[PDB]
Symmetry: C3
Subunit: 114 residues, 3 copies
Amino acid sequence: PMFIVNTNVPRASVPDGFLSELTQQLAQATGKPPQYIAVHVVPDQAMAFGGSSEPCALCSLHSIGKIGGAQNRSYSKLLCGLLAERLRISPDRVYINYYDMNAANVGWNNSTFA
Amino acid sequence: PMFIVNTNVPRASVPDGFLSELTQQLAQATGKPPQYIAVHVVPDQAMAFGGSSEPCALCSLHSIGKIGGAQNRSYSKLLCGLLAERLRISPDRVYINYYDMNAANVGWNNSTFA
Amino acid sequence: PMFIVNTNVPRASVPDGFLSELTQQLAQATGKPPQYIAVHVVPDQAMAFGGSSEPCALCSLHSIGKIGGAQNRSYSKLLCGLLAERLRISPDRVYINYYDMNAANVGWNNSTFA
């Protein structure tokens, strides 16, 4: 799985250790070994949510399965909880788009997962 | 809905006001209150379109419905028009990918839109 | 087609000519005309792969067709090979997400490809 966060929160306000905490909590949440989890955090962005430039986040989670109704509500509570705790962003100023990827449409290591 | 613009136009050429203008124009165009519209503009990117580094943009528009053949033509005319007028980019150097997102695959406020 | 690369490799390690090589090789692999190929490279990113901050990349390839099982394995071989040779990134620290885009869902030049 791959988790990407784009935020207007400044780089100085992203705590040390955040990439590792995202990797650990996503490995646990998805029930996958951490060797499979990629994370990416992009601060200092020019973005607005509902016309306001108060802290906000636009994020994505891609996974080959383990995506769906109840699972996504659980991911949202975990990930908004981390973004509120670590980056001080309110949960109602966060969007996370979930993508169930087909194994044939994920490349890695010169081939795909198919 | 969520609109993202990535462009090689430099940061000083993006007008103050452009994020607000996009928020209002998209609220009008999607029929959704502006409180729901998230916008994000990333200038200074290393990109090319047809091998050329003339001003160009790679964009995406995600919405829970309000996505389809004739709606997408109208969004492309609206959004290319804003990009040409404000960032001086040729409409034929712009790509906009449209995503009709399932409510259960958009997280927000600790849960999803389902 | 559009190919995006996000990486933690520093901007100074991305060689001159990389965007043009990706454009040409993408045209060679997809058979699509170079004039319509877009490429985008984002270095200096805060990202981890498998809990490690060794060089890695998260990428995406969008194309209106020319996407599927055998084609995607071929693209992964080509693109991991360019990232290893030019950015010194190990192929097993690269993810590439592939998207077969509906022509109606790709805006360009005030309209769509539908």
